[PDB]
Amino acid sequence: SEFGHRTLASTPALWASIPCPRSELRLDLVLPSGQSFRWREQSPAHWSGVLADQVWTLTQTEEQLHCTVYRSQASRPTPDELEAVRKYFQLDVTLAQLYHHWGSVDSHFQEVAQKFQGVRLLRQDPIECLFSFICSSNNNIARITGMVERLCQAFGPRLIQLDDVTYHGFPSLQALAGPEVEAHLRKLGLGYRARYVSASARAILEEQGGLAWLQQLRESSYEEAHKALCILPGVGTKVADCICLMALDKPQAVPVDVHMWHIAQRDYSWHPTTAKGPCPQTNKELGNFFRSLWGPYAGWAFAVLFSADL
DNA sequence: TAGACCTGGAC
DNA sequence: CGTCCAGGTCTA
Ligand SMILES: [Ca+2]
Ligand SMILES: [Ca+2]
Secondary structure, eight states: SSSSSOOOTTTTGGGEEEEOOOTTTTTHHHHHTOOOSSEEEEEEEEEEEETTEEEEEEEOOOEEEEEEEEEEOOOOOOOHHHHHHHHHHTTOOOTHHHHHHHHHHHHHHHHHHSOOOOOOOOOOHHHHHHHHHHHHTTTHHHHHHHHHHHHHHHHHHEEEEEEEEEOOOOOOOOHHHHHHHHHHHHTTTTTTTTHHHHHHHHHIIIIIISHHHHHHHHTTTTHHHHHHHHTTTTOOOOHHHHHHHTTSTTTTTTOHHHHHHHHHHHHHHOOOOOSSSSHHHHHEEEEEEHHHHHOHHHHHHHHHHTTOOO
8 A cells, every 4th residue: 555556546545636527638548649758557547657856646537637646754745736737737728618619610620529538738848848759750659658768767867666666857958968878878779869869958058058948938939939949959840849839838839740641631631732742841731731720729639630540 | 852760569 | 581660850
């Protein structure tokens, strides 16, 4: 009881709720769907990971999101900590209102969405998001997930251990910008991305002004933020869009990848107007198409289709 | 605008 | 067992 990952049943007194119907959130459709790679369903229906520098286990009932934190002296989460959870899930943003708007302007969205509710965007930490996706280029969720964990185990601060799992906080810029980081990352299997991580860490601290420069992007415009991001090695148009969408508060950002193309072609008979294949210009066009169709929160809209495809 | 590219399940 | 493919990016 006192050990291992908790469950709602095992330690009732250590949990606290946040009103939240499954219609507004589905942990199982959000946490493992390629937004964040830090959560694992350690026991059925319970998800554990690092959120706001601490470890949490989350699980949900029909109307409640149950939370528990592992900071000593175990106790339920405090209202402020819970606030950190609400912020992470952007619970002030109402999915029902978004699904409704999207559905009214797109019959296809209407269909699919009725079977995949509660898909929303996580508000991620800029650093974690930047380097997580630096690792995602030309790669799959399973691998990316492993790489990211190895990364944090090797360069992130040790937080706490549960069962045989040791949680780590995400690596700081300083640690990632350190000597021989690349060589160490290659031994960990990040492939050529190993250089990207190192180079982008150095690029930020040594040529852009450090952490501040990145955080500033949240107040910056989507177009600005996206442009800024693109100078960093390993970060192309797609990765940048993922970051603007998931960390820089750019909900109109639409990351186009092979997934997006297939769906665009199959479900909307979409084809390039202004090349006939996947390239900078055609990708830019596809993103505008979905933006013109769905509106200001097109990015959220695509997540519904992206994490509903299979 | 065509490959070159780390890695490991899936074909 | 060689060939693909994954939330692509980068370069003659
Ligand atoms: Ca591909
Ligand atoms: Ca770049």
